[PDB]
Design a protein around this ligand. Structure first.
Ligand SMILES: C[C@H](C(=O)O)[C@H](c1ccc2c(c1)O[C@@H](C1CCN([C@@H](C)c3cc(F)ccc3OC(F)(F)F)CC1)CC2)C1CC1
Ligand SMILES: Cc1cc(OCCCS(C)(=O)=O)cc(C)c1-c1cccc(COc2cc3c(cn2)[C@H]2[C@@H](C3)[C@@H]2C(=O)O)c1
Ligand SMILES: CCCCCCCC/C=C\CCCCCCCC(=O)OC[C@H](O)CO
Length: 418
């Protein structure tokens, strides 16, 4: 049991909210792809376009719920309501799976994806999304649905006539309506749901994997012997011999954090070894200790002990006087864009950006994308299972199911726009 006073009230309250925010969502992705041509902007704009398709179909579904299931527009427009309503209920999953995928790929693998990704590639995914759902629905509609080349009946296209008024699709024969709705859910929903979830997982795991000083030395650097990783020197002799030296160190054939961490873990043992630096490190900031390891990697324990006047000014807890003595040095003149970033960081992470926030925002797009699929689309998609397995259950479940599914239009743009 579901009263029409409530069903109409839910379908119009979701339309009054869905329509403008989607207009804000579309405008947002158009403005941000003009300024940069972002890969997930295509997903956000394409999600908005499909979302609004459902939004303008809500009044007709509100009037349908009013006329109590009965179809109130002519029979020649029901295959156009079906395509406008049920396409975004399945489509949304494919976009939020690629949108959340784009967010994860640039969270876990930022230097690889940035080089890989381009706009046209992302249009390719949506182009395959539009086609897939339009064909899966199209074929299931052109065959199984009442009024196709399978049902030899006088009843119009997608129209069922019970004594009463003609109803569009909802009055479908339970024996055939079940299996046709189950294949749509099984294929077009559980698989895009898995990627979104696995991406949200990966985004959480990209948060715990970062290291403040790595990002500080990634910006700083990036014999002249050919090697791999963030300064993790391979060998002095040339390449098949250098290859397995990297392969046996990680396990995988032919990540740089584990090799930087091990490199730094031993680099601290070198600072302790050099007695002229050891007291200074032990009295310094956790923040300022990383500004010293920056110079240690750059010059060595020789050059670090050489600047004795400035290091003593660091032991004496005087940052401003040491930074001036450091501003007039052979190192400052040698490396001009790196020196100053260490000097300002010694005196005061502010001087260094940029990765925490992007790994955090991307963990929140795929995080919200997971819950909009489990709170909007989800309950609906779960009824195409429960009604399929247990045929005794009434339309009261699916009516609320198609109601939560319709509240996708309000929830989905909030995910992308936060
Ligand atoms: C991030 C990359 C970029 O942007 O540049 C992009 C990429 C990489 C991985 C994934 C990327 C997209 O989309 C995810 C999608 C792909 C489209 N699938 C659809 C088409 C789908 C497949 C099914 F088997 C069943 C239902 C489906 O749902 C539907 F509703 F859309 F139909 C949803 C997952 C999976 C992971 C690369 C250019 C290719
Ligand atoms: C196949 C077809 C034929 C057609 O016209 C045939 C020519 C008309 S005539 C014979 O009068 O000349 C018009 C359209 C829009 C379509 C068409 C194309 C793409 C998608 C669709 C919409 O399909 C669907 C499919 C399902 C639903 C809704 N719409 C309900 C079921 C399964 C899903 C669900 O409840 O989960 C329909
Ligand atoms: C907050 C967002 C929207 C509020 C819009 C309010 C939704 C409109 C409720 C009024 C309504 O549903 O009236 C129909 C009538 O009761 C049928 O007989």
């Amino acid at each position: 049991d579901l009263p029409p006073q409530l069903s109409f009230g839910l379908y119009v309250a979701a339309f009054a909210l869905g329509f403008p925010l989607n207009v804000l969502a579309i405008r947002g992705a158009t403005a941000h792809a003009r300024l940069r041509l972002t890969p997930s902007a295509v997903y956000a704009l394409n999600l908005g376009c499909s979302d609004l398709l459902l939004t303008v179909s809500l009044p007709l579904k509100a009037v349908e719920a009013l006329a109590s299931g009965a179809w109130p527009l002519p029979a020649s427009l029901c295959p156009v309501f079906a395509v406008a309503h049920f396409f975004p209920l399945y489509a949304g999953g494919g976009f939020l799976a690629a949108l959340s995928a784009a967010r994860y790929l640039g969270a876990a693998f930022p230097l690889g994806y940035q080089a890989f990704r381009r706009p046209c590639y992302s249009w390719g995914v949506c182009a395959a999304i539009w086609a897939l759902v339009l064909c899966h629905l199209g074929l299931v509609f052109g065959l199984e649905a009442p009024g196709g080349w399978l049902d030899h009946s006088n009843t119009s296209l997608g129209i069922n006539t019970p004594n009463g008024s003609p109803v569009c699709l909802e009055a479908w024969d339970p024996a055939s309506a079940g299996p046709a709705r189950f294949s749509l859910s099984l294929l077009l929903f559980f698989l895009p749901l898995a990627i979104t979830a696995f991406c949200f997982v990966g985004c959480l795991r990209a948060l715990a994997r970062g290291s403040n000083i790595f990002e500080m030395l990634r910006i700083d650097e990036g014999e002249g012997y050919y090697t791999i990783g963030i300064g993790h020197l391979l060998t002095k002799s040339p390449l098949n011999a250098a290859k397995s030296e990297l392969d046996k160190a990680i396990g995988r054939n032919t990540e740089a954090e584990k090799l930087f961490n091990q490199d730094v873990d031993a680099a601290v043992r070198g600072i302790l070894r050099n007695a002229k630096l050891k007291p200074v490190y032990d009295s310094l900031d956790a923040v300022r200790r990383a500004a010293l390891i920056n110079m240690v990697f750059q010059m060595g324990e020789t050059g670090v002990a050489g600047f004795t006047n400035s290091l003593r000014m660091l032991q004496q807890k005087r940052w401003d006087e040491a930074a001036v003595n450091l501003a007039k040095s052979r190192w400052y003149n040698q490396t001009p864009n790196r020196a100053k970033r260490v000097i300002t960081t010694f005196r005061t992470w502010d001087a260094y950006g940029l990765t925490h926030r992007r790994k955090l925002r991307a963990a929140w797009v795929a995080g919200g994308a997971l819950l909009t699929l489990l709170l909007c689309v989800g309950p609906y998609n779960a009824s195409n299972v429960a009604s399929f397995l247990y045929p005794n259950l009434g339309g009261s479940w699916r009516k609320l199911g198609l109601i939560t599914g319709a509240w996708s239009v309000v929830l989905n743009p909030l995910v992308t726009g936060y």
